Each structure stands twice: as C-alpha cells, then as structure tokens.
Amino acid sequence: VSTKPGSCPIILIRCAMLNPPNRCLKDTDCPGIKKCCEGSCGMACFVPQ
C-alpha cells in the first residue's frame, strides 16, 4: 500500500458508510507524488507532507 515518500494526512471526518468506494488501493495507483490514503469517504489520492 505505502511505497512513496511523505505521509498521508490525518482526516477526522468520515462518511457513514461501512464500505465506501476506493479510488485507489496503493500509492502506485495515484499519480505523481500522491499517496493512497484513508480519506473522508473511502481511499483516495493525496499530496503528502
């Protein structure tokens, strides 16, 4: 899952879904430097810090 440098953001907001849709499963599914991270509603690609 985590291969690229930097860290995923901490997100303290969630949708009320047991199985929200993932736009990515690992970092290499995301373009550029972006990491695959637990977002507010399923996995998503984020610019890391």
Side-chain angles (χ1 to χ4, degrees):
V1 177
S2 196
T3 49
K4 291 184 194 178
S7 316
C8 282
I10 286 163
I11 318 279
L12 295 166
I13 168 163
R14 294 282 138 83
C15 63
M17 289 184 86
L18 271 38
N19 298 118
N22 305 321
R23 307 155 194 72
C24 64
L25 303 178
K26 40 178 182 223
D27 291 355
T28 59
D29 304 332
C30 298
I33 74 164
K34 305 196 185 184
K35 283 175 76 64
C36 188
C37 310
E38 203 69 81
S40 59
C41 204
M43 306 281 292
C45 296
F46 284 93
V47 174
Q49 291 73 236

